[PDB]
């Protein structure tokens, strides 16, 4: 049938791509970086502890100033912290308590959040009457919002469980661009350092690179064995790391179009919830179901330290834009800073 | 600039005392997650409590808020972890639609052995018992064609049939009851329990059952916390 011919042609295309990748794999990243010196033992310690949340935390995002940060708990709250002095700047109650993601606009003017209500809510932090309240609210998704990140104060991209991502114009409230093609639920998105492109990790064990301004999928990577739960970019912008339920971290390159390195240990059998690079990209931090956070050497595949400080599942983490510290949110209702 | 430190400190004070009032309200609120297939009698249970994502009801000065997700897809895998801390899951099943009982058993098995729901107790509602009695008394679709174990099944000695209930109806609904308990007792190991209940669409005593079973859940949790039970 026509459908049969189509499947045959697609299998052919896949074989062709696989072969191009085989052609580019003359060496491995470990052989190339075997002569580098190891980063040494990395023993980070808890420098701050941020308390107050009544339920399991699901999302956090540092600000550009590396001082303020937002945290989302499923008690229906979104608390903003002054990480230096542990003071709370705002405590925003949510109309729906089932929040799953939260972002902090790079201008510090707005926060966003969403969850099982299928709605992205924007809150204006620079209110004129005194208190932060709802400003906009983005509707249209048929699935749960898993991740969202601002580009500027009027454009925002979202990831949803309807197997789609969407680019929004916050003012008009219209989905200015739609990203379809994932088979399973999209769990995480990561914006390029230049706002120009972004990748998405879905439950089909695949990541996709999307052109922000044109709305087309440029590259599709299939390296993970199970659902991809987290994704971050290398500071350079031409590489990214993913974490999945198969207890592995993987580094993909954009220009080479294949995996470069796999981060695993045979004593780690539990999934991965969050991933993030250091300022130089030399350190890769990953949060696991085993209550710990592992710091991997992104060049040598060696683990250089552990962060054993949470009493429940580590749900999220994130490094400041100045690289001074990393924060970790877990299901114990606590945030911890590690410098 | 020290004044700005005192303004931040009193803003933090007003925040923490609002969070203290929110803590007191949240600590006494019983979150209840409602799960189950469609065309099962899900909307009728909420109608009886008096379709909507939310429900708010009080039993004996104790508030509950029960939620069913409606605009979700059917892959309940990743969003299930949004309910690892709920007080109880109310799983609704059809005792009458014999073709879909294996689906209910598979969903119950995946919920009971979930890595993140190891401690969440489930209140099992076996809905549509009147239709179940209709089908069993009619004798056109027999349970043995779908569950051959039913041929060798013996009515339990603890069974409490209603006045006039046909022993065939008693054995059928207690067979489905034990079909779910055979799963619940295989790997619960005292961390959580399953509480079966026979319900019909016009049964007004459903909030009382959930009240009693939530009280039993908390009693058992406290008893195991002190290592007694």
């Amino acid at each position, epitope marked *: 049938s026509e459908l049969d011919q189509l499947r045959q042609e697609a299998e052919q295309l896949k074989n062709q791509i696989r072969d191009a990748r085989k052609a580019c794999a003359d060496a491995t990243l470990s052989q190339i970086t075997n002569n580098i010196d190891p980063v040494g033992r990395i023993q980070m310690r808890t420098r701050r502890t941020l308390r107050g949340h009544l339920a399991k935390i699901y999302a956090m995002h540092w600000g550009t100033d590396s001082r303020l940060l937002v945290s989302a708990s499923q008690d229906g709250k979104l608390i903003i912290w002054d990480s230096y002095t542990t003071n709370k700047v705002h405590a925003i109650p949510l109309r729906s308590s089932w929040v799953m993601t939260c972002a902090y606009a790079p201008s510090g003017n707005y926060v966003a959040c969403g969850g099982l209500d299928n709605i992205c809510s924007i809150y204006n932090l620079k209110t004129r009457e005194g208190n932060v309240r709802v400003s906009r609210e983005l509707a249209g998704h048929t699935g749960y919002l898993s991740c969202c990140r601002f580009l500027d104060d009027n454009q925002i991209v979202t990831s949803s469980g309807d197997t789609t991502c969407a680019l929004w114009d916050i003012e008009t409230g219209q989905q200015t661009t739609t990203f379809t093609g994932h088979t399973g639920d999209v769990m995480s998105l990561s914006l390029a350092p230049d706002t120009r492109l972004f990748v998405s990790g879905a439950c089909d*064990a695949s990541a996709k690179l999307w052109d922000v301004r044109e709305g087309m999928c440029r590259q599709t990577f*299939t390296g993970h*064995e*199970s659902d991809i739960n987290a994704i971050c970019f290398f500071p350079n912008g031409n590489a990214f790391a993913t974490g999945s339920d*198969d207890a592995t971290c993987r580094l993909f390159d954009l220009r080479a179009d294949q995996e470069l390195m796999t981060y695993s240990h045979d004593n780690i059998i539990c999934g991965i919830t969050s991933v993030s690079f250091s300022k130089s990209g030399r350190l890769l931090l990953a949060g696991y179901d085993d209550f710990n956070c592992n710091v991997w050497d992104a060049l040598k595949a060696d683990r250089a330290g552990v962060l054993a400080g949470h009493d429940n599942r580590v749900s999220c983490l994130g490094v400041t834009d100045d690289g001074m510290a990393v924060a970790t949110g877990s299901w114990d209702s606590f945030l911890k800073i590690w410098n | 600039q020290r004044n700005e430190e005192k303004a931040q400190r009193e803003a933090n004070k007003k925040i923490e005392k609002q969070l203290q009032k929110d803590k007191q309200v949240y600590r006494a609120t019983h979150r209840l997650l409602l799960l189950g297939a469609d065309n099962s009698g899900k909307s009728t249970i909420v109608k009886q409590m008096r379709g909507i994502f939310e429900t708010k009801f009080q039993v004996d000065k104790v508030n509950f808020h029960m939620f069913d997700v409606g605009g979700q897809r059917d*892959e309940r895998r990743k969003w299930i972890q949004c309910f690892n801390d709920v007080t109880a899951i109310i799983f609704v099943v059809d005792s009458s639609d014999y073709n879909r009982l*294996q689906e209910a058993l*598979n969903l119950f098995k*995946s919920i009971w*052995n979930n890595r993140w729901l190891r401690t969440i107790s489930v209140i099992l509602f076996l809905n549509k018992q009147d239709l179940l009695a209709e089908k069993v008394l009619a004798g056109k679709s027999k349970i043995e064609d779908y569950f051959p174990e039913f041929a060798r099944y013996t009515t339990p000695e603890d069974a409490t049939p209603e006045p006039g209930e046909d022993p065939r109806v008693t054995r059928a609904k207690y067979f489905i009851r034990d079909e779910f308990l055979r799963i619940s007792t295989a790997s619960g190991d005292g961390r959580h329990y399953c509480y079966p209940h026979f319900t019909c669409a016009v049964d007004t005593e459903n909030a009382r059952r959930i009240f009693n079973d939530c009280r039993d859940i908390i009693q058992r949790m406290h008893l195991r916390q002190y290592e007694l039970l």
Partner: nanobody
Amino acid sequence: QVQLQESGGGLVQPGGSLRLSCAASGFTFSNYKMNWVRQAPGKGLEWVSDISQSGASISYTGSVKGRFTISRDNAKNTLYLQMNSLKPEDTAVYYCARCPAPFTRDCFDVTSTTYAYRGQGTQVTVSS
């Protein structure tokens, strides 16, 4: 690339025997619980049979109980379903479905429309 090809099945008279063989690539076969799920024409998907990580735990639907067998070859990395005593109601498209996560006893792989870790299908007909 999580890749599945099931094979076998065809025009078989009632009472016949069939062998369905699912070849799996892109993942570690031993770590994953596996299922056989069938889709009858004009009806939704129903779960047929389960397996364990090492084959220790086995379960079937009541319809196929005592007539269908499921097995694993970890070294060769295949999942086998021996179908015996076929009935006209047994005509359906057969899928070998992997449970989403390793080292788990639970999975949600009877997805109505789109389950990622699912095969293309081998339609099986039983008729006189």
